[PDB]
Design an enzyme around this catalytic site. Structure first.
Site, PDB file in Angstrom:
ATOM      1  N   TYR A 286      56.649  57.936  21.553  1.00 51.69           N
ATOM      2  CA  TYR A 286      57.706  57.044  21.093  1.00 51.69           C
ATOM      3  C   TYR A 286      58.186  57.473  19.718  1.00 51.69           C
ATOM      4  CZ  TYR A 286      55.537  54.421  24.814  1.00 51.69           C
ATOM      5  OH  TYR A 286      55.008  54.037  26.026  1.00 51.69           O
ATOM      6  N   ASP A 288      59.885  55.513  17.360  1.00 51.58           N
ATOM      7  CA  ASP A 288      60.277  54.115  17.171  1.00 51.58           C
ATOM      8  C   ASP A 288      61.564  54.053  16.355  1.00 51.58           C
ATOM      9  OD1 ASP A 288      57.228  54.530  17.256  1.00 51.58           O
ATOM     10  OD2 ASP A 288      57.276  52.376  17.625  1.00 51.58           O
ATOM     11  N   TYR A 292      64.412  54.139  19.270  1.00 54.02           N
ATOM     12  CA  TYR A 292      64.529  52.689  19.444  1.00 54.02           C
ATOM     13  C   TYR A 292      65.225  51.951  18.310  1.00 54.02           C
ATOM     14  CZ  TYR A 292      61.466  53.029  23.530  1.00 54.02           C
ATOM     15  OH  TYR A 292      60.942  53.291  24.771  1.00 54.02           O
ATOM     16  N   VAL A 294      63.964  50.987  14.556  1.00 58.46           N
ATOM     17  CA  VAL A 294      63.035  49.940  14.163  1.00 58.46           C
ATOM     18  C   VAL A 294      63.727  48.787  13.440  1.00 58.46           C
ATOM     19  CG1 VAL A 294      60.994  51.495  14.029  1.00 58.46           C
ATOM     20  CG2 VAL A 294      62.334  50.962  11.945  1.00 58.46           C
ATOM     21  N   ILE A 369      58.067  46.613  18.482  1.00 64.40           N
ATOM     22  CA  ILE A 369      58.539  47.541  19.495  1.00 64.40           C
ATOM     23  C   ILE A 369      57.593  47.390  20.670  1.00 64.40           C
ATOM     24  CG2 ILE A 369      59.032  49.900  20.041  1.00 64.40           C
ATOM     25  CD1 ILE A 369      60.726  48.979  17.878  1.00 64.40           C
ATOM     26  N   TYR A 372      53.696  47.097  20.200  1.00 56.94           N
ATOM     27  CA  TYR A 372      53.368  47.448  18.811  1.00 56.94           C
ATOM     28  C   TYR A 372      54.097  46.569  17.811  1.00 56.94           C
ATOM     29  CZ  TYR A 372      53.032  51.892  21.392  1.00 56.94           C
TER      30      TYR A 372
END
Ligand code: CU
Ligand code: CU
Ligand code: NA
Ligand code: NA
EC number: 1.4.3.21
Lengths: 618, 618
Positions: A286, A288, A292, A294, A369, A372
């Site tokens: 990942y 993050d 994604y 964060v 996430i 996590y």
């Protein structure tokens, strides 16, 4: 009016308006990323610019677009070949799609039926796909799904991983490309519900309150929305959907003059590589920050439990998928806290007993996430020290625990496993030690042999090697010899005629463990070395490049340093890799207590004497 | 009534009474060390015993004496050959003698006259002599003197070192044995008076108060004078004049049963080696613990500035030079403090948002050894973690700064130098992980090659090597491979059928830098390696032996491990070396901001799941 101020709801709407007016934000368009750009070098005529990645749900190519909100114009707009330069960040609306598609797929339903699992109860984690051997994926937006059983709406699905099963899905065309079932593994049965009285037992009644108050308010001032002034320190607290809290213009008021230290400080990437060679998870890494974002999942932090004491909150504003502003309410905490003794001495000869207390300014946010959760904390201390700390918690990512054990997975509960992994950060520190003419030296302790000049064999010393060009600025740790790196300004001297400087102290944790031939070693090349130094460029923002999602090697740090530019007394950028290597423990289950990693920089001949002599007695 | 309770004023008097009654404490006798002994293994009939080192001011040989205060008897009393086994600890009354003798010495007066220094203004630091080439010193109590000018009664003499000059003195015979004058160096002129308004400037008015209160009092209870109970933890806080705060019986209440973790925890030695090859300082190494006894110089800590919040103090009692009790008033601070987030998770699937706060119990003292001041802090966390931190402050030890610079000294102010040095601690951890049958494994991260079994080259693992006998239990750090050491109990298994354990995480700072042939490498052999494991013996208390002062190699750790005893599932002791390597910086002058070093141990499969599930919401 400060050009480093936070984006307002109004500016985001106006970017939406400009893009719409220009025909770039039609009803099939979705904003995957939107952030304010930093002013150019030597900018201080206000020109607020925003960068936007626009995705198209009809399968058309996405666009990278730069807008000027002050002038109401589009500066540039270019079409991306995502197979070449990388897919756009995963969209929040795509998270749910992986499960949704899979529910009506015969291969998935057959996988679930073979395990006597009710499809209505099977949650699916939408995980980034990365880049491996699947040629059909090149140019397509893929997510991989791993299944967890949720027994009822408020059950922790993480307790019930469905191993031996993984699916690959195209979230634009809305097709399932593959379903791999390598065989049934028992689904762990114990629940991991950490608010259930039967697992918790009776709650403790022994904790008496701790009350932290400031009857006159805090010693820091906030002006212009995000400019902080505190105990000689001054900075601007920014927020970006990708990086989260970014710090700008870190400077210290040493007498008359405001002395710059760091121009820009951020966590520019974080990667979570998994070390289980099972084909069910061996693809799992990942980013993050890069994949994604964060910042967009930053939590709203509640008073009296997320942040304790006299807290001042910022509520940064981001764009949703359509260009409307949404505020992350109480997303950034700012407060000061006591930090024990700062300095102390009881002198026999003078009879003077002296004690002063320390304190630090804390600027933090917390993001989530999937399983996590991470806290990102920046600290400014009275003595000039600057520190970052990452706090890792959440629920560990689970698998089955094989019968007969595993060299790559640990057991948390009967049949329940936790694959080995790392959490690795890159801090991007655009240095400005007394301004921009900076240089970096590597400092090692030097042992000396007993002999002529050192007849008692007590001597020890140190050495410093200037990193003169980018080709010699890719460095590794050496804890044994006390290795640090000093950032100095060769043209600003302290009163003793030495270059002013700050010393970076790392934790010397292991870097990326994956084989150097691995896909992850290339996509996370930054993570294989502890310290990089580059010459500053306005387009070199992330160690992984601008588009990380399903993007192979070829961008980011290794390509930046190939330019082999001069860094001996130039505008330079320090990228420090630091991370945690996690072999999970039974104590991490069912919810993990915080573990920390970080770094700090301390003044090294920056000041002419201690900068805390004027701190008053308590 | 607890056999681990602190020594009372009455017990010390009674030891005095017993020694007197037995003819061992005549008017020429002085107590150099007095401490209560720990109960023997399997002791729990109360037998409070005390060990005493008695010095004789008439030049007679000293005695090591063991007394039983419960029975009013002398158990043993043996005469020491100090040339063989080491001189007794430096006495506080001897500190002043070095200056006093030197004031009327023609060679010293001539040295001072050559530099136009008034003898009435020259302070002399009484430094331990160690063991070098001076044969006449063997068997005699020697201190070496280094001179600092004090301009007026409340001046900081450290600002004005007198370099090129050192003297050797016999504090029993009251003679000066040697005066070495290698040549005049300018005496630095700037003052280092950190309470003087002209150096401080106007004091800051910007610090608003931080108030830390507990309206219901603290969550810990103190019973029997020094037994602490806190959030499942239980222990006894001891105090010894040599080691300072010692922790006994560290245990954790896991449900029904009180589970031992560490039997005894202390800082069993600390050494400060100097790395300047000048003959004026190349002999300089301080064993603060072993030579000077850090406990006896423990500060009285003031409320609202040394220790902040709801504080409970202990006032430990020690013997003066004659056997009378003196209390160190408010010498030990005990309090609990908030420690941020303990665990947090915001789950999408369940809709449950969860946050818990951490806290720690703090047990600390602060000691002053000439120019140096050290804080010793032990922390117990909610999650089972145990931590030590040393806080180093005070005034740096000074010299002249040579013209043309130095590889072994840094410049703090014009003509003012600070020789390079280390501060190195040994923590002695008498382990009791679920009891005394323990073993230690060394754990390294293991990288794996891409190939069969690992085709994506993502796998990584770990390995553990049992340290089976003392001959293979002398270990060094390896930060690169994430080296830690796990202390387990091979006969106590958690619910997953794994041995319960605690993992020691070091900072991996440099160990002793001196050449291995050096006198200090032998006297501080412990400091050359990061981790030692020995089989427990009641007479193996310090890594340097019982008498460190002017005592060559031959005792302590290297001689203990020569026995090569079994440590695979036995009563074992972990000795961890950790330290700071200090190249002083201009910011350290005139008074040094705190710098920290330490270590911690975290549960590793000790508990059956997280031990903080029963912590309530805030
Ligand atoms: Cu982890
Ligand atoms: Cu030091
Ligand atoms: Na820079
Ligand atoms: Na033991």
């Amino acid at each position: 009016a400060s050009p480093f101020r936070l984006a307002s709801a109004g500016e985001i709407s106006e970017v939406q308006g400009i893009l719409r007016t220009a025909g770039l934000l039609g009803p099939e368009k979705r904003i995957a990323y939107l952030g304010v750009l930093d002013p150019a070098r030597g900018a201080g005529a206000e020109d607020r610019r925003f960068r936007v990645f626009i995705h198209d749900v009809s399968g058309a190519r996405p666009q990278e677009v730069t807008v000027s909100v002050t002038n109401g114009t589009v500066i540039s707009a270019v079409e991306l070949d995502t197979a070449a330069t990388g897919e756009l960040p995963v969209l929040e609306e795509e998270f749910e799609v992986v499960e949704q598609l899979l529910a009506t797929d015969e291969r998935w339903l057959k996988a679930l039926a073979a395990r006597n699992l009710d499809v209505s109860k099977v949650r699916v984690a939408p995980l980034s796909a990365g880049v491996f051997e699947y040629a059909e994926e090149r140019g397509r937006r893929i997510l991989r799904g791993l299944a967890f059983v949720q027994d009822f709406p408020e059950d922790s699905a993480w307790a019930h991983p469905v191993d031996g099963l993984v699916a690959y899905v195209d979230v634009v065309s809305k097709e399932v490309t593959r379903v791999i079932d390598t065989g049934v593994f028992p689904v762990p049965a114990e629940h991991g519900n950490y608010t259930d009285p039967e697992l918790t037992g009776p709650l403790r009644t022994t904790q008496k309150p701790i009350s932290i108050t400031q009857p006159e308010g805090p010693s820091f001032t906030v002006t212009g929305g995000n400019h902080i002034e505190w105990e000689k320190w001054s900075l601007d607290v920014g927020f970006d959907v990708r990086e989260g809290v970014v710090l700008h213009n870190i400077a210290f008021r040493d007498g008359d003059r405001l002395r710059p230290i760091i121009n820009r400080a951020s966590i520019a990437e974080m990667v979570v590589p998994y070390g289980d060679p099972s084909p069910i998870r061996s693809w799992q890494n990942y980013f993050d920050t890069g994949e994604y974002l964060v910042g967009q999942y930053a939590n709203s932090l509640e008073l009296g439990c997320d942040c304790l004491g006299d807290i001042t909150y910022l509520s940064p504003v981001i764009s949703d998928a359509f260009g409307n502003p949404r505020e992350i309410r109480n997303g950034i905490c700012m407060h000061e806290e006591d930090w024990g003794i700062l300095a102390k001495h009881s002198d026999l000869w003078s009879g003077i007993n002296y004690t002063r207390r320390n304190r630090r300014m804390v600027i933090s946010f917390f993001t989530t996430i999937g399983n996590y959760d991470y806290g990102f904390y920046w600290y400014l201390y009275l003595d000039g020290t600057i520190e970052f700390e990452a706090k890792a918690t959440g629920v560990v990512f689970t698998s089955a625990f094989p019968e007969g054990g595993s060299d790559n997975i640990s057991q948390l509960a009967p049949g329940l496993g936790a694959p080995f992994h790392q959490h690795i950060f890159s801090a991007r520190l655009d240095m400005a030690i007394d301004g921009f003419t900076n240089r970096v030296e590597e400092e090692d302790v030097v042992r000396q042999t007993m002999g002529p000049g050192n007849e008692r064999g007590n001597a020890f010393s140190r050495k410093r090697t200037v990193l003169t060009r980018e080709s010699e600025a890719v460095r590794e740790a050496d804890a044994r010899t006390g290795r640090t790196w000093i950032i100095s300004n060769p043209e600003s001297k302290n009163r003793l005629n030495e270059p002013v400087g700050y010393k970076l102290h790392a934790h010397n944790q292991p870097t990326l463990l994956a084989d150097p031939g691995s896909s992850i070693a290339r996509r996370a090349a930054f993570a294989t070395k502890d310290l990089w130094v580059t010459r500053y460029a306005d387009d070199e923002r992330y160690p992984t490049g601008d588009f990380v999602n399903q993007h192979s090697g070829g961008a980011g740090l290794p390509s930046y340093i190939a330019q082999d530019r001069d860094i001996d007394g130039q505008d330079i950028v320090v990228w420090h890799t630091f991370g945690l290597t996690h072999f999970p423990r039974v104590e991490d289950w069912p919810i993990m207590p915080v573990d920390t990693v970080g770094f700090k920089l301390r003044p090294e001949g920056f000041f002419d004497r201690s900068p805390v002599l004027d701190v008053p007695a308590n």
